[PDB]
Write a protein that binds this DNA or RNA. Structure first.
Length: 91
DNA sequence: AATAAAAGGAAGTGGG
DNA sequence: TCCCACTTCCTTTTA
């Protein structure tokens, strides 16, 4: 199955949920979720995965934080903002 | 208080 | 066996 970081990168490239997520600085790989519309994006992630429970933004961000150690996605010190690694952006 | 973002330990689930 | 890549649950902290 698709990995969470790839699902988010794919959405940013397609623009299909432009009111839920957007690039802040695409050259740096920084992106930001919508305060009011992030839950719809989280719901889509859970459905794509076929998870038993409804996915929430809180649970999706819990998964996002696990990428901090390996580097694929890191939290930025700005509201609802994260950053992909150069490796993820290049791949 | 009400609301929200951010955090992570711990245990459960999937598919190797 | 036992790690993958999350998911689920619960609690805490800060603004």
């Amino acid at each position: 199955k698709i990995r969470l970081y790839q699902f988010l990168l794919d959405l940013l490239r397609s623009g299909d949920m432009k009111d839920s997520i957007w690039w802040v600085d695409k050259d740096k790989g920084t992106f930001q979720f919508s305060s009011k519309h992030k839950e719809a994006l989280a719901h889509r992630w859970g459905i794509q995965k076929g998870n038993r429970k409804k996915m929430t933004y809180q649970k999706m961000a819990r998964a996002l934080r696990n990428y901090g150690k390996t580097g694929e996605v890191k939290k930025v010190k700005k509201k609802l903002t994260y950053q992909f690694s150069g490796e993820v952006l290049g791949r």
